[PDB]
Amino acid sequence: QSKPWNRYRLPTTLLPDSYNVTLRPYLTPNADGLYIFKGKSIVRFICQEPTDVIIIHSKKLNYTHMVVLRGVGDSQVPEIDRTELVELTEYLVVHLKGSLQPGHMYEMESEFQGELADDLAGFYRSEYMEGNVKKVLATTQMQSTDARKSFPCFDEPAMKATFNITLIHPNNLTALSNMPPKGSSTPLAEDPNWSVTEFETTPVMSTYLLAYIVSEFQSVNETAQNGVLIRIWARPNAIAEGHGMYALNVTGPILNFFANHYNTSYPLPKSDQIALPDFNAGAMENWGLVTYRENALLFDPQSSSISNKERVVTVIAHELAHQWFGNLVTLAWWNDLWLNEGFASYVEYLGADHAEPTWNLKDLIVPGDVYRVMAVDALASSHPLTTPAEEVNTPAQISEMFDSISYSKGASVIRMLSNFLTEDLFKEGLASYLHAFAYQNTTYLDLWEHLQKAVDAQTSIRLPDTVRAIMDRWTLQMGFPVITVDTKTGNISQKHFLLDSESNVTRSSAFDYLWIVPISSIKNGVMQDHYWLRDVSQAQNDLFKTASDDWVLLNVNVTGYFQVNYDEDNWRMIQHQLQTNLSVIPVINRAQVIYDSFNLATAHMVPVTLALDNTLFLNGEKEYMPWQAALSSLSYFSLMFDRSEVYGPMKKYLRKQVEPLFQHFETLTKNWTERPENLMDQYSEINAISTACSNGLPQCENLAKTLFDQWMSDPENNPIHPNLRSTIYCNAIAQGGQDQWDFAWGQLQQAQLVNEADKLRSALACSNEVWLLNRYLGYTLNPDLIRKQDATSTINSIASNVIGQPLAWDFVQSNWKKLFQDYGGGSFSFSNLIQGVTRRFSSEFELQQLEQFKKNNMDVGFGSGTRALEQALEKTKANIKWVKENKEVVLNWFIEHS
Amino acid sequence: LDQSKPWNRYRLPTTLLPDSYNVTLRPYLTPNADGLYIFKGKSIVRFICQEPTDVIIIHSKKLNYTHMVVLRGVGDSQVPEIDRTELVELTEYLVVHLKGSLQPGHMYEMESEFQGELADDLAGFYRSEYMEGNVKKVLATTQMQSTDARKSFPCFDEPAMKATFNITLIHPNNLTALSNMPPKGSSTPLAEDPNWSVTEFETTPVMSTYLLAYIVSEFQSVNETAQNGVLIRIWARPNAIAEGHGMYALNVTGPILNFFANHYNTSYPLPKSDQIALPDFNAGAMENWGLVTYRENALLFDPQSSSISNKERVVTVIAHELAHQWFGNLVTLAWWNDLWLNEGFASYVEYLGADHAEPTWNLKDLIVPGDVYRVMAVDALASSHPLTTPAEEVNTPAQISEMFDSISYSKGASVIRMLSNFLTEDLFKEGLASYLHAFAYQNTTYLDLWEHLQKAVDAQTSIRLPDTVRAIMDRWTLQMGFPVITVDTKTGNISQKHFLLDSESNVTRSSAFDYLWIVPISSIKNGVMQDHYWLRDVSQAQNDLFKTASDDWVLLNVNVTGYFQVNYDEDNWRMIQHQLQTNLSVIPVINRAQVIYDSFNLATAHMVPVTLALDNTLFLNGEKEYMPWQAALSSLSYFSLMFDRSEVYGPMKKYLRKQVEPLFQHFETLTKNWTERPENLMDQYSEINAISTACSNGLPQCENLAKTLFDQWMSDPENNPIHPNLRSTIYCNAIAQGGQDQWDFAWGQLQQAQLVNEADKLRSALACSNEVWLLNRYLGYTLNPDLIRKQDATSTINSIASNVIGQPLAWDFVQSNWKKLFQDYGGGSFSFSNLIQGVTRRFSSEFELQQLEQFKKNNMDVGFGSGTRALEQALEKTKANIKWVKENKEVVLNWFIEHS
Ligand SMILES: *[C@@H]1O[C@H](CO)[C@@H](O[C@@H]2O[C@H](CO)[C@@H](O[C@H]3O[C@H](CO[C@H]4O[C@H](CO)[C@H](O)[C@@H](O[C@H]5O[C@H](CO)[C@H](O)[C@@H](O)[C@@H]5O)[C@@H]4O)[C@@H](O)[C@H](O[C@H]4O[C@H](CO)[C@H](O)[C@@H](O)[C@@H]4O)[C@H]3O)[C@H](O)[C@H]2NC(C)=O)[C@H](O)[C@H]1NC(C)=O
Ligand SMILES: *[C@@H]1O[C@H](CO)[C@@H](O[C@@H]2O[C@H](CO)[C@@H](O)[C@H](O)[C@H]2NC(C)=O)[C@H](O)[C@H]1NC(C)=O
Ligand SMILES: *[C@@H]1O[C@H](CO)[C@@H](O[C@@H]2O[C@H](CO)[C@@H](O)[C@H](O)[C@H]2NC(C)=O)[C@H](O)[C@H]1NC(C)=O
Ligand SMILES: *[C@@H]1O[C@H](CO)[C@@H](O)[C@H](O)[C@H]1NC(C)=O
Ligand SMILES: *[C@@H]1O[C@H](CO)[C@@H](O)[C@H](O)[C@H]1NC(C)=O
Ligand SMILES: *[C@@H]1O[C@H](CO)[C@@H](O)[C@H](O)[C@H]1NC(C)=O
Ligand SMILES: *[C@@H]1O[C@H](CO)[C@@H](O)[C@H](O)[C@H]1NC(C)=O
Ligand SMILES: *[C@@H]1O[C@H](CO)[C@@H](O)[C@H](O)[C@H]1NC(C)=O
Ligand SMILES: *[C@@H]1O[C@H](CO)[C@@H](O)[C@H](O)[C@H]1NC(C)=O
Ligand SMILES: *[C@@H]1O[C@H](CO)[C@@H](O)[C@H](O)[C@H]1NC(C)=O
Ligand SMILES: [Zn+2]
Ligand SMILES: [Zn+2]
């Protein structure tokens, strides 16, 4: 560990200035069936401190000494002793016979070769059909640490430089990169069948934002209001069919919106958006060349759903948000990832709302992010938004940082921050921040300084403490408080929300798990004065003290990142209001009441009957979010109980509650022919239909059967509205047999819209026949049938089926080596797989099997799913206790109310 | 522990031998303050000293003593002082250390007083319970075999140590007391308390401890004196007797006893033979001399509600138990390593006795699907064992319990039938009569049997053998396994080799006979019998009997009388196939089954291409008889276990639908739309299988039938419209098609069932649900004695595991509840072994093997008791399954697709 090349962080002795990179992809296999790329690069770097070793990143590259070292101007150049590759720390190491001089620059040259693999990382290959022709293209994904997989570089985000990219490609293919082309392409001297395309120099930026693509893709375009050229690229067929039109509608105006909102121009002449058939995450914010999954950019007005449409605008908005938060201004290191991802996850709502103002999509942050992340942030094995820099060291640890904490808690905490500052004041602070650190890097402390500057120049908004004092507690310690109110005395208290008394908190907090909390409140339907709970375990205020015929609720619209519990009497008054006139309570807080009480019940802080009682009013609820809250909450109940005697009465209860909503949606939609007008009501319909069919409501089963029967009789004319397809497809396959399954499989393999393929993949997992589900699992590891990008999500879908649960858990264990080698170093997929197949575990036996699984595979380890496994273990232990203590009361409650 | 001390060895010393026992027992049929049911006892055993010893070692298990022993002399005997007494739990001994040695040639009497629990554990003196109206009834009953006599009173508890027994029962004055013998005089009030009475019984014959029985209950009886003067009584719950459920047993029991008496020229020596049905009982029945005990589904019968299969079970189990009166009771095995001398014989001559009571059934043929091919599946393993194992291998109680298996019962019956067949039963029974007369009230080994059979052979001329009886039968008895006989019909070349599954099969049990057999070979050529042949103990021979012209075919082992399987060259196989296609009638029906059985078994062991076996099912399209279809169903059952979670399953079910549909349609017509059963037993069995197969593979006509009838039953539950023969299938398929409504209805019927036959069909059918939550809830019930009797717990678990959806549920269930399962059944005949086998049957992957290995490792501390060999066989079979599935799955998939 005393040798620098055996440590995961680079030395500070050398800093890069600029790169020349030329890459040449071969889109046809050689004799060994390998797709390869060849490359050559020159990096210019400066020596800051004397050193006799050059340490630079290199991953899965073969060198054809491995480097040539030259000097810039004055520099005296030491001889190369030897060069070696250190694979563990992913280094190319150049041992010298003498030291480099400080203040002096050097240029290092290399020639290399790597595989154009189907692994979705570095420079990789993507494939599709066009008619009967197999097409292969070359594309990139550098984040987090795979730029090193395409050329040797100082591969850390803060070490910014300019890049001069050249692509050598077949003369009838299009070459794309971050910047526009520099002049025209020229024929490759040795062979005019190839062309050479040089691109303009990049801005000072991070290695992980580099991109370059060689394909036959086509585009549509428009110049945006701020003069920036927007293009939408995709497979020729998708463009011809008009599937890029929607992205073109929204991209430019959203880019222009952010520039104005943050008073900071986008400094590139273009922003390309491109849809790839093979892609790991949802998208990637490469500066000037934003890459996308097809289901995140393309859109078919006749075949895509309102949900698909919403995904497209928010992912685009998210990626464009990064152009400021990530690209222009970049985290100093991955331990501060939320500076990138937290902001993009919040700012995406702002951008998307600008493009689709009628949706009220800003409200979707509460189910989508706030309560999404609280499930994990309640664990002792969570982590704070900003982790200690030394905890984030290996590539696996970096990958795992891309989680619901960095994204969703980051967005939630930032919304709370915006809300008590006002967005007007917030964006002034952010503008100051962006201008000051443009083309550089930041930490969380830099953010506070510019927000504080804004608050101090300003007299209308007042705070109980400095921005840092308040925000350090939401940022540097994990978790969140439960705020408890005694409405008889107005006593208000706070404590760290934890699942168990068993929960063993070992991460020490310098802030003693106390927060400064912004508390809004509403009494008898009328807004009260704002209040700030200081960093103390308890306080008192008459705002929270009620008369016996009054009621209060705190955290209006759940702007604050916390949950609320009341005394039993105030809960009863809330319940009575929801029966008498639920309109008096804001719709989001109707959801809150369900979310919080179930979550409290999960942690045995309130009786379970409280949570269940809070769903009784849903009988007469039409609106999206309170129903969403109940479905999300009872989803945990299903996972715990859908293999027990509780399941029968639970479904009976759900049938009873949802039937009136189903009937409501049967009439207003005119027998399902006319969709509801606005987004929320369309979402409401989708959930009602899903719930009705999921819980066996006969009217829904017959609807699904009839529609799917009709489709099979006329395959070219799909009679099912896109909004309804996921439920109709699933229920019909569940009701049906092999005829339905094989039909849908045929539709899947010929699908020409990814949205539709996505729905088919999920519905196929709904079979009630073991042999079909197991045969399906077998397909997931066959790239001809299921793309690698979709393998884990399909496995998770099958595991969600109660009959598929043991099949998938067995499958995952038996195929672990392949699954780990393919995904175990990546973000999202691997972690989601582990969380997915272990969600149900609620017995000592299941826990022992998880522990045995862990022991069996310890030597290799669990890579970017290491924290996921720990959380999986903690949550199963908690589930064991909760099921044991809750089963009897829950069973009886369902029986009595159904 | 110190093996130099006799109280630390499992076998008793031979220094002391029992003469007679006095045993007084008093069951308390109401619990004490702690909720314990107990029994109190007093016993005196008289024994002789054969050789000088300063220690008395006697068996004792779970008894509390109130030293623990008083030792007295008979007349002259020099009586040593007792130094001290101790209980050694591991070897289940009461140990009396003496000052100086007992005197050889002289007798002693040893008295003890003791207490034990009347547990619900089905062993020793235990309790059984049932409802009568709204009153909970409790009774006391016994089960001593293999070695729980010691659990009721201290005794020399080994089968060869016979004695007479004077039993006294102290019981409530309004309950009936039964034992082996009739009462001696009247009952008398208990002196201290006339609410109790005292019943002394007549002295038993000289017999083994494991045959003792005594019962205290409210039961009633029907009776009849048999043709041989013996009183027969049928005992059961008062309500069962009142409804006439004991009548069929009364019809057949006496005649079967008289038949055996005459057949073996050996009279039954006791004045009575009681048969009694118990609500709680481990095995099928037990042959206690004078008081035969039974599961209710083995003795009782309702002509309106029981099936023909239920009927066949009753008469064959009774015949089996009565068979034991000679083979087991009168003449007893010397030690448990020769168990087949008891059980092989009872499993064979049960067919003879049942055929006497029901001669129209032709039930003797049922030995082929029931015993021969049943046991071959396991006897194909390196981890099998011979009929007679080395005595030193059968030592502990777990090992003794383990011997009660398909080898000792089913291979035993098969080999004995083979023996009977080549001696002729007339000659056989003459040798057996000589055997019984010579060893009456004593004990035997396999060698004693050959000697008397040989004497019969030598005293005649018409029947010829190629060697001594011992030379032939030692090879079938002392080494495990069986040969595959392979013939090249172009040359007449015939050869034999030990049948094993894999090329990795690791046989470590050495054979002094080099795994060669002397084999009786019958044959048929183009439908006409050929001269008989014996293959000698040689790996290869040649005979023109087995050489055919290209126009001819031959088949060996007519009616599968011999315990072996047969393979032919491909051209002879093709000729057989052509015969089956052209005119199947030319081939004897049992041999049509054999063709299927053998070809699938060879396919399983990679000895023939799988396509051969599958091709041999193509003619079933036009087959109407029971046994060839049974062969296919039993054979494809393995395919189902291997493939019902794979892409093969769809095409497999499709093929089976296609094949069974004409048979379904045949019976729909013949039975006049299912209203009239076929006349004979075999055709009734064929209908049952046709219906089961059609529904299980999703034939829509059958599915419609089951839903319609079950809907009709639910609309009028007191008038069940489903004929008993069809209930198992109809119930199952309706439950599978249906939901919670059907399940809860069936559960209600089960918990109010007054007939165990019906309860059994309901239990099995409830396991057919396709809803995980219903199956898992059901599993929870199986360890609740209020809902599922302990006697039915493991069979119910096995039914659920057979459901492809229930497989992971039951495997997890068994693993997570193993501690309770082991201490309840691990000691422990039939149930425990069956449970391990049932839940692991499907394993065919490296992952499943690893999981089974880990399971083994996890519980090695306690061990696996009477399921130890079963676990080793499970592991061996899993390993073979991995290889077979890997190498067969492609050909099997393509075959089913093409032919469906
Ligand atoms: C598949 O193979 C089988 C043979 O294994 C074929 O069956 C044979 O078919 C023959 C042609 O019909 C038939 O023919 C002739 O039979 C009777 C005499 O039969 C009686 O005695 C003999 C010997 O004892 C039979 O074994 C005996 O058995 C059978 O029939 C009984 C019922 O009556 C039994 O109940 C039954 O179980 C058993 O099958 C039988 O009792 C003669 O009367 C007959 O003469 C008449 O037909 C002649 C024309 O061929 C003649 O010219 C006329 O003048 C006169 O009307 C005689 O020819 C065999 O009996 C029969 N064998 C067996 C064992 O059944 C079967 O046909 C074939 N299947 C196909 C599709 O080809
Ligand atoms: C990539 O190309 C750019 C643009 O030509 C180069 O940037 C120049 O670098 C030189 C040498 O240090 C400077 O003197 C110029 O001011 C830069 N030109 C500009 C900013 O227009 C850069 O050196 C190249 N990168 C390399 C060679 O690694
Ligand atoms: C059980 O009772 C029998 C029959 O009464 C006893 O058998 C007698 O035993 C004596 C003493 O050895 C013999 O001399 C008689 O011949 C036996 N009578 C018979 C066979 O009718 C037997 O002793 C008793 N068992 C005991 C006391 O343990
Ligand atoms: C990199 O490319 C630029 C533009 O072609 C060129 O001027 C420069 O010399 C190259 N840098 C080197 C060779 O270090
Ligand atoms: C890299 O080198 C290794 C070892 O020579 C080889 O296995 C691999 O195929 C090479 N990859 C290339 C040339 O892309
Ligand atoms: C990171 O940014 C700071 C300015 O906030 C700058 O001083 C520092 O040099 C940067 N680090 C690197 C490696 O360029
Ligand atoms: C329920 O409360 C709302 C206020 O949000 C009010 O508009 C409505 O009139 C109330 N309902 C009734 C029946 O008055
Ligand atoms: C056994 O019982 C019989 C009958 O009561 C009695 O004659 C005999 O003495 C008893 N044996 C003893 C007490 O050893
Ligand atoms: C035997 O004695 C043990 C030790 O106290 C006791 O636990 C058990 O209940 C007793 N059994 C009886 C009295 O049947
Ligand atoms: C067992 O039977 C043999 C005769 O076959 C006999 O000699 C021997 O004494 C018996 N053993 C015992 C313990 O009675
Ligand atoms: Zn992002
Ligand atoms: Zn028996």
Can you list the pairs that B41-44 forms with residues at least 24 positions away whose Cβ atoms lie under 8 Å? B41/B113, B41/B114, B41/B115, B41/B116, B41/B152, B41/B153, B42/B111, B42/B112, B42/B113, B42/B114, B43/B111, B43/B112, B43/B114, B43/B153, B43/B154, B43/B155, B44/B109, B44/B110, B44/B111, B44/B112
Count of other CB atoms within 10 angstroms of residue A579: 12
CA distance A398 to A383: 13
Give the H/E segment covering residue B589.
helix B589-604
**Strands (DSSP E) found in B764-892:** none
**Closest C-alpha to ligand 10, atom 13:** B161
CA distance A798 to A547: 52
Give the H/E segment covering residue B112.
strand B107-117
Q: Phi, psi at residue B342, to the nearest 5°?
A: -80, -60
**Closest C-alpha to ligand 4, atom 9:** A20
Statement to judge: residues A156 and A279 lie in one domain? no
B429's tokens: 């029974």
CA distance A169 to A222: 27
Nearest Cα to Cα of residue B720 among B762, B671, B668: B762
CA distance B432 to B349: 12
Give Cβ neighbours of residue A1 (< 8 Å, ≥ 6 apart).
A7
Are B299 and B316 in contact by the 8 Å Cβ rule? The answer is: no
Nearest Cα to Cα of residue B483 among B539, B409, B544, B542: B539
Classify burial at B624, counting beta carbons within 10 Å of its beta carbon; exposed 0-12, middle 13-18, buried 19 or more.
middle
Q: Which of B24, B44, B169, B188 to mutate to test the pocket of ligand 8 (most atoms within 8 A of CB)?
A: B44
Q: CATH number of the domain that B141 lies in?
A: 2.60.40.1730
Nearest Cα to Cα of residue A6 among A84, A74, A68: A84
* Residues 780-799, chain B, touching A (beta carbon < 8 A): 780
Are A333 and A156 in contact by the 8 Å Cβ rule? The answer is: yes
Statement to judge: residues B152 and B77 lie in one domain? yes
Statement to judge: residues A461 and A605 lie in one domain? no
What one-letter code names the amino acid at B298? A
As a 3-state breakdown, chain B gives helix, strand, coil percent values, each rounded to 5, of: 45, 20, 35
Give Cβ neighbours of residue B799 (< 8 Å, ≥ 6 apart).
B763, B764, B766, B767
Yes or no, beta carbons of A843 and B646 under 8 Å apart: no
Residues written for chain B: 900
**Strands (DSSP E) found in A49-88:** 51-57, 62-63, 67-71, 80-86
Statement to judge: residues B647 and B518 lie in one domain? no
Give Cβ neighbours of residue B374 (< 8 Å, ≥ 6 apart).
B406, B410
CA distance B599 to B596: 5
Count of other CB atoms within 10 angstroms of residue B435: 24
C-alpha to C-alpha distances, A854 to A401, A811, A840, A880, nearest whole angstrom: 21, 15, 17, 18
Are A452 and A282 in contact by the 8 Å Cβ rule? The answer is: no
Q: Phi, psi at residue B506, to the nearest 5°?
A: -110, 85
User: Nearest bound ligand to CA A586?
Assistant: 7
Torsion of CA B558, B564, B569, B571, to 10 degrees: 30
Statement to judge: residues B294 and B409 lie in one domain? yes
Q: CATH number of the domain that A551 lies in?
A: 2.60.40.1910
Paired strand residues for A553: A522
CA distance A363 to B140: 72
Statement to judge: residues A206 and A303 lie in one domain? no
CA distance A29 to A415: 50
Rg (CA), chain A: 28
Q: Is A83 in a helix, a strand, or coil? A: strand
Residues written for chain A: 898
Statement to judge: residues A795 and A664 lie in one domain? yes
Are B640 and B841 in contact by the 8 Å Cβ rule? The answer is: no
DSSP B744-770: HHHHHHHHT-S-HHHHHHHHHHHTT--
A438's tokens: 């443009």
Classify burial at B569, counting beta carbons within 10 Å of its beta carbon; exposed 0-12, middle 13-18, buried 19 or more.
middle
What one-letter code names the amino acid at B531? D
Count of other CB atoms within 10 angstroms of residue B194: 10
Are A602 and A636 in contact by the 8 Å Cβ rule? The answer is: yes
| B859 has a chain A CB within 8 A of its CB | no
Nearest Cα to Cα of residue B239 among B134, B119, B344: B134
CA A3 to chain centre: 37
Stated resolution in angstroms: 2.0
CA distance B702 to B690: 10
Give Cβ neighbours of residue A462 (< 8 Å, ≥ 6 apart).
none
Statement to judge: residues A207 and A272 lie in one domain? no
- Return the exposure string of A422-451: e unless at least 16 CB atoms fall within 10 Å of the residue's CB, then b: eeebbbbbbbbbbeebeeebbebebbbebb
| Å between A845 CA and nearest CA of chain B | 6
Yes or no, beta carbons of A810 and B847 under 8 Å apart: yes
Q: Is B93 in a helix, a strand, or coil? A: strand
Question: Is the beta carbon of B493 within 6 A of some atom in ligand 9?
Answer: no
Yes or no, beta carbons of A774 and B645 under 8 Å apart: yes
Q: Is A52 in a helix, a strand, or coil? A: strand
**Closest C-alpha to ligand 3, atom 1:** B166
Are A152 and A101 in contact by the 8 Å Cβ rule? The answer is: no
Count of other CB atoms within 10 angstroms of residue A550: 12
Q: Is B190 in a helix, a strand, or coil? A: strand
Give Cβ neighbours of residue B451 (< 8 Å, ≥ 6 apart).
none
Q: Is A770 in a helix, a strand, or coil? A: helix
Statement to judge: residues B398 and B275 lie in one domain? yes
Give Cβ neighbours of residue B558 (< 8 Å, ≥ 6 apart).
B522, B523, B524, B529, B588, B591
Q: Phi, psi at residue B93, to the nearest 5°?
A: -115, 145
DSSP A225-271: TTS-EEEEEE-HHHHHTTTTHHHHHHHHHHHHHHHHHTT----SSEE
Count of other CB atoms within 10 angstroms of residue B610: 22
Paired strand residues for A146: none
DSSP B469-526: HHHHHHHHHSS-S-EEEEEETTTTEEEEEE--S-SS----S--TTTT---EEE-EEET
Positive or negative CA dihedral for A715, A719, A725, A730?
negative
**Closest C-alpha to ligand 5, atom 3:** A62
Q: Does the annotation place B290 within a ligand binding site?
A: no
Are A117 and A141 in contact by the 8 Å Cβ rule? The answer is: no
CA distance B632 to B528: 25
CA distance A86 to B372: 66
| Å between B558 CA and nearest CA of chain A | 40
Closest residue in chain B to residue A643, using alpha carbons only: B773
Does A319 qualify as catalytic in the annotation?
A: yes
- A778 contacts in chain B (CB < 8 Å): 647
Torsion of CA A253, A255, A256, A260, to 10 degrees: 140
Closest residue in chain B to residue A844, using alpha carbons only: B816
Are B226 and B254 in contact by the 8 Å Cβ rule? The answer is: yes
Number of structural domains, chain B?
Answer: 4
Q: Are strands A218-223 and B231-236 parallel, antiparallel or unpaired?
A: unpaired
Yes or no, beta carbons of B816 and A843 under 8 Å apart: yes
Which of A697, A771, A817 to mutate: most B Cβ within 10 Å?
A771
CA distance A798 to A793: 9
Statement to judge: residues B194 and B234 lie in one domain? no
CA distance B149 to B288: 12
CA distance A186 to A197: 7
CA distance A477 to A471: 10
Give Cβ neighbours of residue B855 (< 8 Å, ≥ 6 apart).
B815
CA atoms within 13 A on the CB side of A732: 24
- B801 contacts in chain A (CB < 8 Å): none
Are B482 and B497 in contact by the 8 Å Cβ rule? The answer is: no
CA distance B431 to B228: 23
Last residue of a domain, one of B518, B533, B568: B568
Classify burial at B392, counting beta carbons within 10 Å of its beta carbon; exposed 0-12, middle 13-18, buried 19 or more.
exposed
CA distance A119 to A98: 40
Paired strand residues for A109: A42, A68
Q: Is A42 in a helix, a strand, or coil? A: strand
Q: CATH number of the domain that B644 lies in?
A: 1.25.50.20
Give the H/E segment covering residue A521.
strand A521-523
CA B282 to chain centre: 11
Domain membership of residue A414 as a residue range: 218-479
DSSP A276-297: ESS-SSSEE--TTEEEEEGGGT
Q: CATH number of the domain that A343 lies in?
A: 1.10.390.10
Count of other CB atoms within 10 angstroms of residue A56: 22
Question: Helices then strands (H, E): number in chain B?
Answer: 29, 31
Are A376 and A382 in contact by the 8 Å Cβ rule? The answer is: yes
Question: Is the beta carbon of B583 within 6 A of some atom in ligand 1?
Answer: yes
A582's tokens: 């639920």
Last residue of a domain, one of A455, A479, A503: A479
CA distance B823 to B832: 10
- Return the exposure string of A309-335: e unless at least 16 CB atoms fall within 10 Å of the residue's CB, then b: bbbbbbbbbbbbbbbbbbbbbbbbbbb
CA distance A640 to A884: 11
CA distance B457 to B767: 53
Nearest Cα to Cα of residue B209 among B412, B38, B396, B60: B60
Nearest Cα to Cα of residue B408 among B340, B320, B347: B340
Statement to judge: residues A538 and A592 lie in one domain? no
First to last CA, chain A: 65
Question: Helices then strands (H, E): number in chain A?
Answer: 29, 31
Of A643, A738, A814, the CB nearest to B772: A643
Statement to judge: residues A622 and A667 lie in one domain? yes
In chain A, which residues are last before a break of more than 2.5 Å from C to the next N?
64
CA distance B369 to B374: 7
Q: Is B63 in a helix, a strand, or coil? A: coil
Query: Which residue, chain included where needed, has tokens 């400066």?
Result: A46
Give Cβ neighbours of residue B536 (< 8 Å, ≥ 6 apart).
B466, B467, B518
Give the H/E segment covering residue A219.
strand A218-223
Last residue of a domain, one of A522, A544, A566: A566
Question: Is the beta carbon of B166 within 6 A of some atom in ligand 8?
Answer: yes
Question: Is the beta carbon of A639 within 6 A of some atom in ligand 6?
Answer: no
| B773 has a chain A CB within 8 A of its CB | yes
- A843 contacts in chain B (CB < 8 Å): 816
Are A450 and A433 in contact by the 8 Å Cβ rule? The answer is: yes
Task: Find the angle CA(B200)-CA(B443)-CA(B263) to the nearest 5 degrees.
Answer: 85
Q: How was this structure determined?
A: X-ray
| Å between B644 CA and nearest CA of chain A | 6
| A642 has a chain B CB within 8 A of its CB | yes
Give the H/E segment covering residue B735.
helix B727-737
Instruction: Categorise residue B672: left if φ over 0, alpha if ψ from -120 to 50, beta otherwise.
Output: left
Question: What DSSP character marks residue B368?
Answer: I
Classify burial at A823, counting beta carbons within 10 Å of its beta carbon; exposed 0-12, middle 13-18, buried 19 or more.
buried
- A643 contacts in chain B (CB < 8 Å): 772-773, 776, 809
Question: Is the beta carbon of A164 within 6 A of some atom in ligand 4?
Answer: yes
